[PDB]
Structure 1
Amino acid sequence: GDRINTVRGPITISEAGFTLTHEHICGSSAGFLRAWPEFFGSRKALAEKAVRGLRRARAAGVRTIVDVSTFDLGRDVSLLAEVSRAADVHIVAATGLWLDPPLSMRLRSVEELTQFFLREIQYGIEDTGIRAGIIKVATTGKVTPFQELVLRAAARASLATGVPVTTHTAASQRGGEQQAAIFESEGLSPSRVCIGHSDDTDDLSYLTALAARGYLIGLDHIPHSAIRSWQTRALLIKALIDQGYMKQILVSNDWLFGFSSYVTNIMDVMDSVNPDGMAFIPLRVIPFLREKGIPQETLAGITVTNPARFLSPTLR
């Protein structure tokens, strides 16, 4: 109804505050952090880096983040719980599947995938009793046969629980179009769905058409500009506000503190390019929008009200 499951337990809508809806503590692979923690220096070093990063975002106003790391991104909810407590920042955990499913997942039916997503929402993740509050899915432009099963399983899990769905897309391939078609074929309401990485395109008519159908538009790669400037990506926010779709916007950094599912030392490159980390949205994008004339009430609606409406489990 109006309670959201976090890694520390359920919270009410009003407790969520300023929420970043697409983030990671650690981008990895299933089993990897526990099998090879020295890849990150140590588990303690990674935890301490994440706590400093969250404590800084908190000092910039952030009160909640949604960690959209799935099973196959190496989600370690025990890590999330530890860092959430030390930082005093709410963390919402995810179920779903990203782009690296192991064989034991790739060979499952849509019915089996539905049961796994439902277990993580309704019973808990692993043996921790921590329940997921969002379902994360991913496709690569043209949806593969397995990715279609994942999206349908995600829709069915969302329909049984009211928990929202958030996606990874290739925006340059207009990948949200095929995602939306599958979701609607399942009877999922677009207001339960965020089409993510949408700021990777300049095609405003693609974004507006999705927003016009009721989808949330995830503009979460603003600090990933590395030819368009981050200011140019951020102007997509103002463009959608001006078209009257302020209610459909979600904003985030898609940041992380460890990253093993990429080449070695990528985290050092990323941190040198965006030293603000997860504080980039509150420290840079929000003042940029206020200076371009966006009023405080609109910015509060995007960063507080929109994520509350999105994360609150709803079947209406």
Structure 2
Amino acid sequence: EMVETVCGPVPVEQLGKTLIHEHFLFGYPGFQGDVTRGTFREDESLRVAVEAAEKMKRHGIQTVVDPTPNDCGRNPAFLRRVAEETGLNIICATGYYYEGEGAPPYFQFRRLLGTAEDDIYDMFMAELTEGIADTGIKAGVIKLASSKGRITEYEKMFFRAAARAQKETGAVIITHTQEGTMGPEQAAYLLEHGADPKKIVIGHMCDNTDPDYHRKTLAYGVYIAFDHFGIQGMVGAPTDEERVRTLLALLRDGYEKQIMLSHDTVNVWLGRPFTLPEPFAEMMKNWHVEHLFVNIIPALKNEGIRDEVLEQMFIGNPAALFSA
């Protein structure tokens, strides 16, 4: 009936049109050490984050899931400010990123102590059922992530802890896959450990252009997310044209009740500002929160995708995902 947002419990039936994977803030681990030159400018950051939220609202978005990992600058209190200003529902996560873009030393050390996996489960339970730090905000999803071609031993600790927490709480799991790998493997591993496929979203699935890879993942009964719309020009990433091609094939096969769409935007980068070099910068120009609504959805409609199917993906699926 209810889901935890940054403003507290909200009825699942009130979530409405949802973006399943966007970041208001995000930083690569290590950004914290560059505080002198890469200061967090909260006022400007809030202005930018609120502007992004308003752009989403303009296209009927009422809810956003922000799965910023705990080790990547997650800031629930900041999200609450965005939500308070805009009236958007924002659902945050508990979880760590994958090894290559994460900060593994801490839980690797606890693994040497023999307690890491239990500590992670304890962290998930605390943040799902008690609150994050002193904010009073509970996470509404568990974020999991794996490496390219491998769910590492470090990563598997989180996967097992997540399955355990899910069995206890009924919490939704949202995942990151790296470079179009491990979708089927994540689903199989989570299900081995008793996780509920109807509560799992395997992310970044659109990074792989082989429809058989998607169908192998869909076979487990999980949700999949095409959540990289706008990300073009590598590393390895396919084009939006290719993403649309893959999506159309799955919709023709009747998989709409298992698919959600997003952009995985980073609206405010933590640390120093940066500029992409020009070939890449132009290829990435559509990576913003309006892209699905201005470009992608019109293209789907051009191919004959019905409004009810679009509504299934943006409204029906998040409602079902967060319902018992």
| TM-score normalised to structure 2 length | 0.88
| Within-5 A mapping of 1:237-248 | 237-248=247-258
The Cα of 1:87 is off from its aligned counterpart by: 1.9
- Name 1:25's counterpart in structure 2: 24
- Name 1:145's counterpart in structure 2: 153
> Which has more helix, going by share of residues?
1
Deviations 1:231-269 (A, max 9, x none): 321232221111111111011010011224798335997
DSSP-derived class of the 1:177 partner: helix
- Name 2:267's counterpart in structure 1: 257
The Cα of 1:282 is off from its aligned counterpart by: 2.0
Contact 2:120 2:161 in 1 (8 A): yes
The Cα of 1:3 is off from its aligned counterpart by: 0.6
Deviations 1:191-232 (A, max 9, x none): 211111110111100101211220111101121023743132
- Name 2:12's counterpart in structure 1: 13
The whole-number CA distance in structure 1 between the counterparts of 2:35 and 2:292 is 32
Change in CA separation of 1:203 and 1:294 when aligned onto 2, cut-off 3 Å: same
DSSP-derived class of the 1:4 partner: strand
| Within-5 A mapping of 1:261-272 | 264-265=274-275
DSSP-derived class of the 2:175 partner: strand
The alignment yields a C-alpha RMSD, in angstroms, of: 2.5
| TM-score normalised to structure 1 length | 0.91
State whether structure 2 residue 199 is matched by structure 1 residue 192.
yes
Match of 1:104 among 96, 103, 106: 106
- Name 1:309's counterpart in structure 2: 320
- Name 2:53's counterpart in structure 1: 54
State whether structure 2 residue 293 is matched by structure 1 residue 291.
no
Kindly provide the amino acid, as one letter, of the partner of residue 306 in structure 2: P
The whole-number CA distance in structure 2 between the counterparts of 1:98 and 1:200 is 18
The Cα of 1:79 is off from its aligned counterpart by: 0.6
The Cα of 1:40 is off from its aligned counterpart by: 5.9
Kindly provide the amino acid, as one letter, of the partner of residue 201 in structure 1: N
Q: Name stretches of at least 5 consecutive residues in structure 2 with no aligned partner.
A: 111-115
Kindly provide the amino acid, as one letter, of the partner of residue 123 in structure 1: E
Contact 1:197 1:220 in 2 (8 A): yes
Kindly provide the amino acid, as one letter, of the partner of residue 154 in structure 1: A
The Cα of 1:159 is off from its aligned counterpart by: 1.3
Change in CA separation of 1:84 and 1:260 when aligned onto 2, cut-off 3 Å: same
DSSP-derived class of the 2:79 partner: helix
| Within-5 A mapping of 1:16-95 | 16-28=15-27, 36=35, 39=38, 42-95=41-94
Percentage identity across paired residues of the two chains: 30
The whole-number CA distance in structure 2 between the counterparts of 1:230 and 1:96 is 28
